[PDB]
Amino acid sequence: ELKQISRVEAMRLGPGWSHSCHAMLYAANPGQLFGRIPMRFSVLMQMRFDGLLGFPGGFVDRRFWSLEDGLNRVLGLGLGCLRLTEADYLSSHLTPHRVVAHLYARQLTLEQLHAVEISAVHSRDHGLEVLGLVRVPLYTQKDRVGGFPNFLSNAFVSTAKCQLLFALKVLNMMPEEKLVEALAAATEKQKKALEK
Amino acid sequence: ELKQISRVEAMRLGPGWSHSCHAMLYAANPGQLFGRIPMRFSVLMQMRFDGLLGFPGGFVDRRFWSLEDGLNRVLGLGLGCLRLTEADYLSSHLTPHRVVAHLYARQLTLEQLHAVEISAVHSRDHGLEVLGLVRVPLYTQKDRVGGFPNFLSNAFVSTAKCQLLFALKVLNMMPEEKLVEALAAATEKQKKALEK
Amino acid sequence: EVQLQASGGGFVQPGGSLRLSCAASGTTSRHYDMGWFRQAPGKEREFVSAISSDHSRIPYYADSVKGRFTISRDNSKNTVYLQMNSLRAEDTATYYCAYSDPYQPMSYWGQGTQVTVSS
Amino acid sequence: EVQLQASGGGFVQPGGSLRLSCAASGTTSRHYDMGWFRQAPGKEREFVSAISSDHSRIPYYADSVKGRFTISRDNSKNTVYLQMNSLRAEDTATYYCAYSDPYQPMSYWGQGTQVTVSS
Secondary structure, three states: OOEEOOHHHHHOOOOOOEEEEEEEEEEEEEEEEOOOEEEEEEEEEEEEOOOOEEOOEEEOOOOOOOHHHHHHHHHHHHOOOOOOOHHHEEEEEEOOOOEEEEEEEEEEOHHHHHHHHHHHOOOOOEOOOEEEEEEEOOOEOOOOOOEHHHHHOOOEOHHHHHHHHHHHHHOOOOOHHHHHHHHHHHHHHHHHHOOO | OOEEOOHHHHHOOOOOOEEEEEEEEEEEEEEEEOOOEEEEEEEEEEEEOOOOEEOOEEEOOOOOOOHHHHHHHHHHHHOOOOOOOHHHEEEEEEOOOOEEEEEEEEEEOHHHHHHHHHHHOOOOOEOOOEEEEEEEOOOEOOOOOOEHHHHHOOOEOHHHHHHHHHHHHHOOOOOHHHHHHHHHHHHHHHHHHOOO | OEEEEEEOOEEEOOOOOEEEEEEEEEOOOOOOEEEEEEEOOOOOOEEEEEEEOOOOOOOEEOOOOOOOEEEEEEOOOOEEEEEEOOOOHHHOEEEEEEEEOOOOOOOEEOOOEEEEEOO | OEEEEEEOOEEEOOOOOEEEEEEEEEOOOOOOEEEEEEEOOOOOOEEEEEEEOOOOOOOEEOOOOOOOEEEEEEOOOOEEEEEEOOOOHHHOEEEEEEEEOOOOOOOEEOOOEEEEEOO
């Protein structure tokens, strides 16, 4: 729930502001977990070197890079196969630091998403700066935490968690009611965990 | 910090008890993150279909399986390449349910660990029951949470979190002082997060 | 909750044949194990046969039923079958279907079905 | 904190040559970018040249220095070099080394080194 700003407004933020660019790669998923639970969509995130879940991407120094080229530089290191353009640009948000966080997002086919996972495990940053990709489970199991709420209970780069829920909403992959519900089950799971 | 019990004591627990078997695959890692931070060891865990971090493995029905064969059944589905024996058996612990959790652990070479990651992304359960492998960062960064404490802040299968810290200790991959320290930085990070 | 439903059984003349069926409903998995146990007069419940849904291993049999019983499956119906041939008096027992899988702790049992071998 | 240390510069006769060096210390990364800016009399600080540590792309140059300046690196020393040839009066300026990388937000600047081209 960051403050959204227009693309052109973000580009007037220069030296005072650092810029980050991240990629949300996702695919329609017709499969069913256990033959029973529709998966609907699969979204890629990653375990970062700092032990947090985030999106592929990183900080882009505008002294040296366009946002596109700087993003693809980092995607080349950590995913090693795909390149995004301004066609995929989705949002800019304001955030310790003054950072404008840009989100790019692209719908892939499910096998294209799998190809990204296969190239990631051979990438230059795999095992160093990137410690593995994970798929976001977007379903919720019968106990009401299995799946997406449990997943939201992990530790994120805060801007990544905000961007994921923002994108799921504006891309109409999940209604905002269900996002608020899942976030609420996660936070209460977390508070119920802190009882020891 | 589960109650440890002897192998033979666990085998006297039959029908009243469910049994789980998990694999801790790890490797000495001579590399340095950013050229600066010794990585020491790499441990494999995975994002499970329920949105929690855990170890490769699962529940083993002793009506049908030995613990070894049942473990390798699940490893075959989710990792697709390696098989463990009783030579790798490390511990049994008592835990909603009456479960004896058995931990197997094997030191691999770093490239053998990478081969496991490559076979996992082609496995039968990848994208369904297993949503991706991740490496555990065992270093701590200068801010005292980057790396291992942040990683411990994620959401685990509780038995998996206990088994990881138990194994790091008894395998002498990390002194217990440092484990308690990292767990303490994680829990306080979590509590400081629940302020919103 | 996984519920197990069984079909077949009853009276059989020695040397005859009989086929048990069993299906699992509810929170089943994709990779799972199903099989049969039986309890004969004055004995404990003993293993008969088991099969997997995923070609994880070859179906196995108790030594006393090798070459007589054959287990088989239809994972589009989550159903397994026990074809019992050359039935003997030793085969008189309550037969029980069983289900488990690597993703949940519970080992499930179906209700007993009586098979009675007698002339 | 990434600290930048620079070497070289000073007085140069027109058409001569001069080589700047710059190294990064501290919380540096493995994949990073380093380059040079300069501020000439009455102008704003302008891009000169940049290079990457990882062959991510080809080093680039301001149009006014193409074919005269060449940037190069030694990532065993975390050091980059600017070889300035055929120096002209237009090249008189304070030159600044810069460092950044994809893994931390800060864009770092070194201290200015004066280059003075004059007969």
